[PDB]
Amino acid sequence: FRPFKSPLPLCPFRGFFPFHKDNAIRLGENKDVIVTREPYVSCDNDNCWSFALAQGALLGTKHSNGTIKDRTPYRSLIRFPIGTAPVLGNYKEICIAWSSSSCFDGKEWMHVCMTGNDNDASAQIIYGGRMTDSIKSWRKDILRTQESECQCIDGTCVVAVTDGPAANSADYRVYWIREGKIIKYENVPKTKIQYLEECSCYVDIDVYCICRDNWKGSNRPWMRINNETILETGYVCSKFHSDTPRPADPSTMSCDSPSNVNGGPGVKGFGFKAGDDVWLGRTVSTSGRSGFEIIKVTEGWINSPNHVKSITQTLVSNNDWSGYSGSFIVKAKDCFQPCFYVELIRGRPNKNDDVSWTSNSIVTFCGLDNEPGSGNWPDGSNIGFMPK
Amino acid sequence: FRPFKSPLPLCPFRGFFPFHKDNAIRLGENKDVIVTREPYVSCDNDNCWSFALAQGALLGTKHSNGTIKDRTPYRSLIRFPIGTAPVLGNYKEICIAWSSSSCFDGKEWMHVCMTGNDNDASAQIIYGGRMTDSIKSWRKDILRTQESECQCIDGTCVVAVTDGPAANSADYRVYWIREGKIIKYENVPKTKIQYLEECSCYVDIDVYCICRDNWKGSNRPWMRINNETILETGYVCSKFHSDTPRPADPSTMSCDSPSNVNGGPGVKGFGFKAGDDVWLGRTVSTSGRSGFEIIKVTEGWINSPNHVKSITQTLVSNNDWSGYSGSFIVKAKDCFQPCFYVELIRGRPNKNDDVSWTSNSIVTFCGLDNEPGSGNWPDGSNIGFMPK
Amino acid sequence: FRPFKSPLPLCPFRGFFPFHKDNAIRLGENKDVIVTREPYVSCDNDNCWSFALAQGALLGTKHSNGTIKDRTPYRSLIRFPIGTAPVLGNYKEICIAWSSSSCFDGKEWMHVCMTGNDNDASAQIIYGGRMTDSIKSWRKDILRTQESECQCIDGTCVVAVTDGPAANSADYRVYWIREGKIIKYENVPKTKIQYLEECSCYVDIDVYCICRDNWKGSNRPWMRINNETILETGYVCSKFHSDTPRPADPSTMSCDSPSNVNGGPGVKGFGFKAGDDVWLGRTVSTSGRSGFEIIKVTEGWINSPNHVKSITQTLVSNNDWSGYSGSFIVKAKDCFQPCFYVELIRGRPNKNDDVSWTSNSIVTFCGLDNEPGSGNWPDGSNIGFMPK
Amino acid sequence: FRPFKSPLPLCPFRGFFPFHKDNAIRLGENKDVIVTREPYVSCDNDNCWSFALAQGALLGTKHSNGTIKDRTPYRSLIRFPIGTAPVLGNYKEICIAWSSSSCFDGKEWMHVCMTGNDNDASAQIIYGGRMTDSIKSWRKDILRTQESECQCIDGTCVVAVTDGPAANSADYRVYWIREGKIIKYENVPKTKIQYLEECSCYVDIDVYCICRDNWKGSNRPWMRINNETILETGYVCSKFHSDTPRPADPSTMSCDSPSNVNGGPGVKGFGFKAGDDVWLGRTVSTSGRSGFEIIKVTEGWINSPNHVKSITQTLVSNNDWSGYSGSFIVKAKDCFQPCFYVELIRGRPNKNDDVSWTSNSIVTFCGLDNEPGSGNWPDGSNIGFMPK
Ligand SMILES: *[C@@H]1O[C@H](CO[C@@H]2O[C@@H](C)[C@@H](O)[C@@H](O)[C@@H]2O)[C@@H](O[C@@H]2O[C@H](CO)[C@@H](O)[C@H](O)[C@H]2NC(C)=O)[C@H](O)[C@H]1NC(C)=O
Ligand SMILES: *[C@@H]1O[C@H](CO[C@@H]2O[C@@H](C)[C@@H](O)[C@@H](O)[C@@H]2O)[C@@H](O[C@@H]2O[C@H](CO)[C@@H](O)[C@H](O)[C@H]2NC(C)=O)[C@H](O)[C@H]1NC(C)=O
Ligand SMILES: *[C@@H]1O[C@H](CO[C@@H]2O[C@@H](C)[C@@H](O)[C@@H](O)[C@@H]2O)[C@@H](O[C@@H]2O[C@H](CO)[C@@H](O)[C@H](O)[C@H]2NC(C)=O)[C@H](O)[C@H]1NC(C)=O
Ligand SMILES: *[C@@H]1O[C@H](CO[C@@H]2O[C@@H](C)[C@@H](O)[C@@H](O)[C@@H]2O)[C@@H](O[C@@H]2O[C@H](CO)[C@@H](O)[C@H](O)[C@H]2NC(C)=O)[C@H](O)[C@H]1NC(C)=O
Ligand SMILES: *[C@@H]1O[C@H](CO[C@@H]2O[C@@H](C)[C@@H](O)[C@@H](O)[C@@H]2O)[C@@H](O[C@@H]2O[C@H](CO)[C@@H](O)[C@H](O)[C@H]2NC(C)=O)[C@H](O)[C@H]1NC(C)=O
Ligand SMILES: *[C@@H]1O[C@H](CO[C@@H]2O[C@@H](C)[C@@H](O)[C@@H](O)[C@@H]2O)[C@@H](O[C@@H]2O[C@H](CO)[C@@H](O)[C@H](O)[C@H]2NC(C)=O)[C@H](O)[C@H]1NC(C)=O
Ligand SMILES: *[C@@H]1O[C@H](CO[C@@H]2O[C@@H](C)[C@@H](O)[C@@H](O)[C@@H]2O)[C@@H](O[C@@H]2O[C@H](CO)[C@@H](O)[C@H](O)[C@H]2NC(C)=O)[C@H](O)[C@H]1NC(C)=O
Ligand SMILES: *[C@@H]1O[C@H](CO[C@@H]2O[C@@H](C)[C@@H](O)[C@@H](O)[C@@H]2O)[C@@H](O[C@@H]2O[C@H](CO)[C@@H](O)[C@H](O)[C@H]2NC(C)=O)[C@H](O)[C@H]1NC(C)=O
Ligand SMILES: CC(=O)N[C@H]1[C@H]([C@H](O)[C@H](O)CO)OC(C(=O)O)=C[C@@H]1NC(=N)N
Ligand SMILES: CC(=O)N[C@H]1[C@H]([C@H](O)[C@H](O)CO)OC(C(=O)O)=C[C@@H]1NC(=N)N
Ligand SMILES: CC(=O)N[C@H]1[C@H]([C@H](O)[C@H](O)CO)OC(C(=O)O)=C[C@@H]1NC(=N)N
Ligand SMILES: CC(=O)N[C@H]1[C@H]([C@H](O)[C@H](O)CO)OC(C(=O)O)=C[C@@H]1NC(=N)N
Ligand SMILES: [Ca+2]
Ligand SMILES: [Ca+2]
Ligand SMILES: [Ca+2]
Ligand SMILES: [Ca+2]
Ligand SMILES: [Ca+2]
């Protein structure tokens, strides 16, 4: 017997530390590795796992040509041991998906898997390996979800879902799902948030989600959610913005609205509220998906004149390609430890990655209440060595 | 301790949804994948699994040349994680077989494995990994079985077996097997059914099997069976036929006899009785093994003037190759969920598949009481990229 | 908790049936498969396993050239799922060995592993993964053992071991080992047996071993052993001999001495006593390692004028290569089922196998009290397709 | 429930015996095997495991070129089944590391993983898969650790760590870690030891560590440690030295100070105290990393005029390449069995290994209270067959 996961507080932390790294592109030089993108990490009672949307092809084969394409019937959510490259001999196929979320509720895994036509997609809910429920596209425009782990509290899992156009008004919802059965949903209030997608969520008593506004906000939209309802919404107050593209530091403090500058197209990212402060992941570049750093902004969670970047950890240099990033948690004793992954995209459309495919490797970091050192942990592939 | 599976009713459902897809041919471009055909799916308490008849060769190697051939000593029933491509690093070999069935009784797996000479084949019964019993060919003409999962009720498993010619009178039996020991068999009554093979079965209180008449019936033969005996037999009443080849819709309503038109050679397929209605899988083409759709026919299970196709889901376009299809079930709480797989055959003798081998990938769908979206989930291989 | 295996009788049987087949050479065409020889099978509570002496090289690579060689430091006993080809992604390395035996005592696995110099080899005893004891070569001439499964009764395992020359007088012993600790050994009486090696053993209340005389006996030497001592010895009385080479049928009935004809070099083989009768495996050829058949000889276990071959099953045609064969058992309820494997050697020095390496595949059969069909289950490799 | 490992005495032993060997370089000829170095072995309740620092590349691929380099962001501690070659289909990635230690406390695994910049590295402590603590470089000069298994007593694990220059005064510490949390550390006393790194440790009631002085000592520094503190320190008294390089036998008896001759650069090695005697591993060559032998020196642990090499086992000939070696233990009933591994380095900078990469295979031996035979168990690769 295992109990459902509880509403634990986030553990104390003062810096982030290198955890697992798969080096998947380097290891894929001889065409062993499955083409992926939109990876993430999620853990059960016994293991943390890598997840990613595979492309139904091996890296460097003819079928990998053109895998920049976002949605195909040949994409599946796959799972593989954390920090290992995904290969045919180690992967598990979770469901057919070109958008996904996964989370463990203390007893079983839940997955949310979108596939099908852009104008008529459906999300399949998997629980304990069984398809238990589904969501039918209601705006008929690329029904989609987090691309990182959802969160579960006392047996009820919470997941953010979007249907509708990019860079215009769309529908944003949270779904509450228990043992694979949809209990209810809520349309996210639009009093503050104007656009939300690709939420990166964690638990600190309640579920916090920090997401991607691909329309008018260079600042990130966020929600606080419990097992019953959405409790609060906003944009991250920090005058230092964390989407990509975005304005140079310092920019506007916008707690209640999109920054109305450099709003599109954005990238999936994450942050962690800490007291009145906030930690924010972001690309080093303000324009492109290169580099990765994480900053701590004093009073960055609140309306304040005192925002300052107290800490900056540079984890992937600006000379290296990054991509999506997302939060995951690991249960410590009586608190949840904040961790995150960074997708390191290689191939199209990256400048000078002269290959026909698009894929990624993974690197991960976890938070400790200790002072970190410094380093650089990029993809590390010599793109010239690779099968094109 | 685990109890034997019970005689549960089928769960309510109103459409089918994409589950797992292996993309095995695409992933086999670099010769990692085992050549297979006649795949199916079956689940135990903890996992669903892919099964298939391997050909003792890797796809695209010289030994894969000529694998259109149905029966060789080098064919084995293999098992691999559901939705994964079968590779040497992930497969398990269950038994030597060129025809098979597998099912889990709640405690252990049973398999039925035919191999040997066409005129002197034997079926090996495996239970919990041990060879426990066997069936000796009695008509001496390709003793053979379902090529999809059998069914077990309160510890007694039921499996359909045929011995004798194709497109002429043969012998059809059901065998009852408990803990791997043959309890009894029955010759299927020929009052209605004139030919039966390759049964696709599921549980809805009793076992229902919908099978393949390769002789005079474009409609599918069926049986209702319990833990002791065959209870009913017939052909599916639906005036919309579901074998391949078959007449164009609408055709004859034949509840009690073969349609006596477009009877051969047929293809393995499946259906689900639902009240007085019936769901039927079928190729899109009325002549060839291309496309896959599933229809719901109002009152299609009974003798009625009111048959109509209330629903048609097109899951694989007619421009794509299909093949065999079969039912499997997944235990929900107090009901069994209806699912099915579709074999996507590539290679010989398919027109324009210019390779020397014959193999397949898999796609699967499960039934939910929700409205589906729409999509297309074909093999997806560019046959031109493949090692011939 | 699991009890130690008990002294069960052999189950009734009247023929042998195809079980698992790995097709390892066919599947090794693309250099994925580990080079092996001297395979065997042994089972624990939950699985049967393939074992073999690997050669520390992949089939078809430059390091596989010359693997006809019997003993090197690069040979390890490896284990892989039964009926699968041994590959880097599925194998386990048990110990360094160029001669081995393995058996499961009901709780844990024991292995006996010989390696080192011909004139100073030692056998390592492994129990539950730990090296627990050892045997030092005492005749200083290729200390060696069964190359098939040993047997364990009420926690005491029995294994036959030889040290000394081939085709001359050597030392033969049985060792009793409990939880990996050597309890005692006995020098095999030489009142009847003149040479013994490579014993194939099973349990029928007591342990029976049928072995290889590589000196003067075309008939096979045998022993009956319990948890304490050797109880009986002899040669198989059957006037139909079962070593290779051997005289044509019928030959001499020699219950108490080597036949004194066609004695060398012999091949590992097996048999099963059944009442006063005996089942004997043997190559089809009387001179070479080609084909495989199993015969039942009426009264073949005893001194009698009534020996006759009541049954002959031809399992591998004489046009196909065979090799070693050995017994293993599978617990049925209150009896042990007799099974056997056949090593199918390909490569050097086989005539017309034009490659530089030597390896093998595996096929297995189990006994049932049912009438068998007929078939042929050879290696199946087109040696011309293989990397040399 | 499993108890924490106890302070057991070392088991009696009088020689070492071949255990597991992976033949990883031979098996890597077709580019399947992960490039590694600094391997070791450590066991839990159910299995012994191989560990090594991978290089984020497959052997023989372009990314393997230049892997002589010691520290990169693409190095991870990986785990794979003992005696198997590390491949993508069997490995687990434990953490990002270019220096590591691992040990099992009876309940869970702990790992210590150093990565990042040379002048600002940090060690991540992993316990039960979760990052639980860390050590920040304090001398800012390649914070580093054992490269073999740590040891745990009654739930408290002990690990030796160094920060500072090579061939000059550095800082050496022991850390005590419980359930992944650092309890305390101690600076190693410098009353006797002048330099310590790469400790090879085992348990004999207390923890004994025999390490590498890379400065002034051709004799090896050692410590005796319990769950609370460092109890004793010294250099191995044996007038026969065991670092590499070192003086020819016999050299100085230096129980309390470095030999002050042939002190650098040294190699990781191990030994076992036995009564007043000591067993010492060492390369056969006194100058290079070739060959491997283990000696027993009578009274070699103490100050005595009676040191003599009572036993010499030559396990890898001087014509073969060796490398690092380290101790590990296996629980026997009420004692710990002493075992060790030897890293067999191939590639740069080894003379005549004409390839661009640097990697290794593994061989292992365990101690028994029996007389051994003799043999030779080198890497066995024909470097000429390998992809460069
Ligand atoms: C949602 O969970 C609560 C229990 O969790 C607490 O309340 C949540 C709203 C949130 O604030 C958490 O952080 C809190 O820890 C459930 O409330 C329980 O309901 C049962 C049955 O009525 C009752 O016996 C308990 O006393 C309640 N527990 C508490 C602490 O109030 C609530 O039922 C959950 N809602 C759903 C829809 O599952
Ligand atoms: C990646 O693929 C492109 C496109 O390939 C073509 O279209 C595909 C859908 C498929 O049908 C292929 O068979 C086609 O070749 C390649 O670009 C083509 O290259 C060919 C051969 O040099 C050239 O004749 C065409 O004009 C190109 N077509 C286009 C639209 O650019 C490209 O070479 C592939 N990249 C790699 C690294 O192989
Ligand atoms: C077959 O199973 C029945 C129990 O299942 C019920 O009866 C079947 C025929 C079928 O209609 C199912 O859907 C039903 O749920 C067994 O009947 C039991 O037998 C035992 C022993 O005699 C008796 O104690 C119980 O009362 C019976 N149970 C019921 C509900 O009647 C029957 O034994 C099974 N037959 C075989 C050969 O195994
Ligand atoms: C697939 O195999 C066929 C047949 O191969 C021949 O017969 C086999 C049983 C085996 O013995 C092979 O060695 C033989 O080559 C191939 O067709 C043959 O191709 C060869 C060479 O071009 C030609 O000389 C023969 O006439 C052909 N034989 C026949 C009966 O057609 C075919 O090329 C193979 N396909 C692929 C993609 O390689
Ligand atoms: C060997 O096993 C016997 C028990 O097995 C029986 O005797 C064997 C010799 C063999 O004939 C088997 O087939 C039989 O089933 C052990 O005898 C037991 O010893 C214990 C302790 O003295 C005693 O309490 C039991 O009564 C004995 N059991 C019987 C049936 O006699 C014997 O100890 C074993 N010897 C060793 C060395 O382990
Ligand atoms: C299998 O190997 C033999 C022998 O290889 C030679 O000796 C080995 C130990 C090793 O040192 C190799 O590098 C040597 O090549 C091969 O036979 C040799 O082939 C070469 C090249 O054609 C020839 O010059 C030598 O005379 C041969 N030596 C002998 C003793 O025959 C043989 O070709 C290999 N087989 C295959 C299929 O590659
Ligand atoms: C360290 O372990 C001891 C128990 O182990 C013994 O003492 C060690 C110092 C070492 O000498 C071992 O080989 C010995 O076996 C712990 O001592 C126990 O402490 C508890 C709580 O105070 C007490 O109830 C027991 O009586 C003590 N046991 C003994 C045998 O003295 C000690 O607590 C451990 N220290 C730490 C920091 O964990
Ligand atoms: C191993 O690599 C070296 C170096 O490769 C060069 O530098 C690397 C960092 C990378 O940028 C590569 O693309 C470069 O080629 C190889 O040595 C080079 O070989 C090339 C081609 O022959 C030659 O023109 C350069 O002068 C060489 N550079 C140096 C510094 O020596 C070497 O060939 C590789 N080894 C193998 C076995 O391939
Ligand atoms: C469902 C879907 O296709 N989501 C997209 C996504 C999307 O286009 C934008 O967020 C706008 O809505 O962006 C990104 C892109 O890297 O920005 C990759 C995704 N790829 C996949 N999830 N497959
Ligand atoms: C035992 C056997 O060989 N069964 C056949 C089968 C058969 O020929 C017909 O159903 C007529 O009886 O049809 C099909 C074919 O795709 O229609 C493939 C099978 N291949 C295998 N099961 N191996
Ligand atoms: C230890 C050893 O090398 N045993 C031999 C063996 C042996 O030479 C004879 O039985 C004579 O004693 O025969 C055979 C051979 O196939 O006949 C293969 C073996 N190969 C291995 N077991 N590695
Ligand atoms: C952390 C680190 O880089 N340690 C080194 C090491 C080191 O340079 C010396 O011991 C001197 O301090 O020596 C050796 C070398 O083989 O002697 C390999 C190591 N490689 C790795 N552990 N990655
Ligand atoms: Ca934005
Ligand atoms: Ca038909
Ligand atoms: Ca003989
Ligand atoms: Ca491969
Ligand atoms: Ca030194």
Contacting residues of D for C131, CB less than 8 Å apart: 17, 19, 330, 337, 339, 366, 368
Which among B89, B116, B122 is the nearest to C89, CB-wise? Answer: B89
Concerning whether C324 is annotated as a catalytic residue, the answer is yes
Whether B348 lines ligand 4, by a CB cut-off of 6 Å, is no
D37 known member of a binding site: yes
| Token pair listed for C133 | 């004891």
What residue ranges do the domains of chain C occupy? 1-388
For residue D55, CA distances in Å to B89, D121, D358 come to: 23, 18, 10
CA distance B32 to A63: 14
Phi, psi dihedral angles at A164 (to 5 degrees): 135, 180
B289 known member of a binding site: yes
Q: Which residue has the tokens 């003037």?
A: B305
The conformational region for residue B106 under phi > 0 = left, psi -120 to 50 = alpha, else beta, is left
Helix (H/G/I), strand (E/B), else coil: D64:
helix
- The strand pairing partners of D296, in sequence order, are D279, D311
CA distance B221 to A337: 59
CA distance B304 to B277: 10
Q: Is D89 on the interface with A (CB under 8 A)?
A: yes
CA distance D185 to D81: 32
Alpha helices in chain A (DSSP H): none
CA distance C305 to C317: 30
Give the B:C interface size as CB pairs under 8 Å.
128
Residues with Cβ within 6 A of ligand 10?
B 38, 53, 70-71, 98-99, 142, 144, 147, 166, 197-198, 214, 265
Closest CA to A73 of B379, B368, B373: B379
In this structure, are residues B358 and A34 in contact, taking their beta carbons and an 8 Å threshold? no
Query: How many angstroms is the resolution?
Result: 1.6
In this structure, are residues B328 and B336 in contact, taking their beta carbons and an 8 Å threshold? no
In this structure, are residues B251 and B239 in contact, taking their beta carbons and an 8 Å threshold? yes
Ligand nearest to the CA of A87: 16
In this structure, are residues B105 and B84 in contact, taking their beta carbons and an 8 Å threshold? no
CA distance D379 to D28: 12
B14 known member of a binding site: no
CA distance C76 to C98: 7
In this structure, are residues D321 and D290 in contact, taking their beta carbons and an 8 Å threshold? yes
Of D36, D70, D289, the one to substitute when testing ligand 12's pocket (max ligand atoms within 8 A of C-beta) is D70
If you measure CA to CA, which chain A residue comes closest to B368? A133
Q: To the nearest whole angstrom, how far is the Cα of C45 from the nearest Cα of chain D?
A: 16
Query: Dihedral sign, CA of A282, A285, A291, A296?
Result: negative
Q: Is B228 on the interface with C (CB under 8 A)?
A: no
Q: Partners for C (CB, 8 Å, 3+ pairs)?
A: B, D
In this structure, are residues A61 and A91 in contact, taking their beta carbons and an 8 Å threshold? no
| Token pair listed for C357 | 């390496």
Which among A87, A371, A382 is the nearest to D88, CB-wise? Answer: A87
**Tell me, what amino acid is at D138?**
W
Q: To the nearest whole angstrom, how far is the Cα of C52 from the nearest Cα of chain D?
A: 14
Alpha helices in chain C (DSSP H): none
Residue C13: other Cβ atoms inside 10 A = 20
Determine the distance separating the centroid of ligand 13 and the alpha carbon of A221, expressed in angstroms: 9
Helix (H/G/I), strand (E/B), else coil: D213:
coil
β-strands C144-145, C151-153 pairing: unpaired
Compute the radius of gyration of chain C from its Cα atoms: 19
Q: Which residue has the tokens 């009877």?
A: B263
Dihedral (C-alpha) D51, D53, D57, D62: value to the nearest 10 degrees?
A: -130
Which among B34, B89, B131 is the nearest to C17, CB-wise? Answer: B131
In eight-state DSSP terms, residue C301 is T
In this structure, are residues D187 and D206 in contact, taking their beta carbons and an 8 Å threshold? no
Closest CA to B223 of B249, B248, B239, B202: B202
β-strands D48-58, D76-81 pairing: antiparallel
Q: Order of strands, edge to edge, in the sheet holding B122-127?
A: B99-104, B109-115, B122-127, B130-136
CA B366 to chain CA mean position, Å? 15
CA distance C136 to D369: 12
Q: Which residue has the tokens 């292992």?
A: D364
Q: Is A85 on the interface with B (CB under 8 A)?
A: no
In this structure, are residues B250 and B239 in contact, taking their beta carbons and an 8 Å threshold? yes
Residue A276: other Cβ atoms inside 10 A = 15
Secondary structure of chain B in the HEC alphabet? CCCCCCCCCECCCCEEEEEEECCCCHHHCCCCEEEEEEEEEEECCCCEEEEEEEEEEECCCHHHCCCCCCCCCCCEEEEEECCCCCECCCCEEEEECCEEEEEECCCCEEEEEEECCCCCCEEEEEECCEEEEEEECCCCCCCEECCCCCEEECCEEEEEEEECCCCCCCEEEEEEEECCEEEEEEECCCCCCCCCEEEEEEEECEEEEEEECCCCCCCCEEEEECCCCEEEEEECCCCCCCCCCCCCCCCCCCCCCCCCCCCCCCCCCCEEEECCEEEEEECCCCCCCEEEEEEEEECCCCCCCCCEEEEEEEEEEEEEECCCEEEEEEECCCCEEEEEEEEEEEECCCCCCCCCCEEEEEEEEEEECCCCCCCCCCCCCCHHHCCC
Closest CA to A85 of A37, A18, A41, A34: A34
The percent helix, strand, coil of chain C (3-state, each to 5) is 0, 50, 50
Nearest 5 degrees, angle CA C357-CA C362-CA C363? 150
CA distance D112 to B133: 54
In this structure, are residues B121 and B137 in contact, taking their beta carbons and an 8 Å threshold? yes
Give burial (CB, 10 Å; 0-12/13-18/19+) of A305: exposed
Is residue A310 within a helix (H) or strand (E), and if so which, with residue range?
Answer: strand A308-321
If you measure CA to CA, which chain B residue comes closest to A121? B373
CA distance D117 to D148: 22
DSSP for C89-105, written as a single string: TT-EEEEE-SEEEEEE-
**Interface list for D 31-70 with C (CB within 8 A):** 32-33, 43, 46-48
CA distance B283 to B244: 7
Phi, psi dihedral angles at A336 (to 5 degrees): -100, 130
The active-site residue, picked from D70, D154, D171, D276, is: D70
Question: Which residues have a Cβ under 8 Å from the Cβ of D153 and sit 6 or more positions away?
Answer: D4, D5, D6, D7, D203, D206, D207, D226, D227
Helix (H/G/I), strand (E/B), else coil: C306:
coil
Experimental method: X-ray
Find the length of chain D.
Answer: 388
In this structure, are residues A381 and A357 in contact, taking their beta carbons and an 8 Å threshold? no
Pick the CATH number of A1-388 from 2.115.10.20, 2.120.10.10, 3.40.50.1980, 2.120.10.80: 2.120.10.10
Q: Is C9 on the interface with D (CB under 8 A)?
A: no
Find the length of chain B.
Answer: 388
CA distance C251 to C253: 7
| Token pair listed for A77 | 């959510």
In eight-state DSSP terms, residue A63 is G
Q: To the nearest whole angstrom, how far is the Cα of C131 from the nearest Cα of chain D?
A: 7
Of D65, D69, D356, D388, the one to substitute when testing ligand 8's pocket (max ligand atoms within 8 A of C-beta) is D65
CA distance B334 to B8: 6
In eight-state DSSP terms, residue C12 is P
Helix (H/G/I), strand (E/B), else coil: A62:
helix
Binding site for Ca(2+): what residues of A are annotated? 32, 213, 217, 243, 263, 265
Nearest 5 degrees, angle CA B281-CA B269-CA B27? 90
Closest CA to A22 of A56, A74, A55, A59: A59
Q: To the nearest whole angstrom, how far is the Cα of C338 from the nearest Cα of chain B?
A: 11
Q: Partners for A (CB, 8 Å, 3+ pairs)?
A: B, D
In this structure, are residues C71 and C65 in contact, taking their beta carbons and an 8 Å threshold? no
Q: Which atom of ligand 10 is found nearest the CA of B114?
A: 1
State whether D368 and C134 contact (CB < 8 Å): yes
DSSP for C319-355, written as a single string: EEE---EEEEEEE-SSSEEEEEEEEEEEETTSTT--S
**Tell me, what amino acid is at A148?**
S
Residue B369: other Cβ atoms inside 10 A = 12
Give burial (CB, 10 Å; 0-12/13-18/19+) of B329: buried
Nearest 5 degrees, angle CA B39-CA B43-CA B46? 140
Query: Dihedral sign, CA of C235, C236, C240, C243?
Result: negative
Query: Dihedral sign, CA of C373, B176, B4, C2?
Result: negative
Helix (H/G/I), strand (E/B), else coil: C64:
helix
Find the length of chain A.
Answer: 388
Q: Is B30 on the interface with C (CB under 8 A)?
A: no
In eight-state DSSP terms, residue D354 is -
Asked if residue B3 has a cis previous peptide bond (ω within 30° of 0), the answer is: no
Dihedral (C-alpha) B139, B144, B149, B154: value to the nearest 10 degrees?
A: 20
β-strands B99-104, B109-115 pairing: antiparallel
Closest CA to A48 of A74, A6, A79: A79
Helix (H/G/I), strand (E/B), else coil: D385:
helix
If you measure CA to CA, which chain C residue comes closest to D18? C96
CA distance C386 to B61: 10
In eight-state DSSP terms, residue C195 is -
In this structure, are residues D276 and D304 in contact, taking their beta carbons and an 8 Å threshold? yes
In this structure, are residues B277 and B260 in contact, taking their beta carbons and an 8 Å threshold? no
| Token pair listed for A311 | 């800490």
Give burial (CB, 10 Å; 0-12/13-18/19+) of C249: middle
Closest CA to A160 of A125, A140, A122, A186: A186
D243 known member of a binding site: yes
Contacting residues of C for D330, CB less than 8 Å apart: 130-131
In this structure, are residues C16 and C340 in contact, taking their beta carbons and an 8 Å threshold? yes
CA distance B42 to D333: 44
Give burial (CB, 10 Å; 0-12/13-18/19+) of D191: exposed
Q: Is B320 on the interface with A (CB under 8 A)?
A: no
DSSP for C139-186, written as a single string: S-S--EE-SS--EEETTEEEEEEEES-SSS--EEEEEEEETTEEEEEE
DSSP for A230-272, written as a single string: EEEEEE---SS--SSS-PPSS----SSS--SSS-SS-----EE
Helix (H/G/I), strand (E/B), else coil: A337:
strand
Nearest 5 degrees, angle CA A6-CA A11-CA A16? 130
CA distance D278 to D309: 10
Concerning whether D324 is annotated as a catalytic residue, the answer is yes
C198 known member of a binding site: yes
Residue D5: other Cβ atoms inside 10 A = 23
Residue C351: other Cβ atoms inside 10 A = 8
Whether C65 lines ligand 6, by a CB cut-off of 6 Å, is yes
CA A349 to chain CA mean position, Å? 20
Ligand nearest to the CA of B382: 2
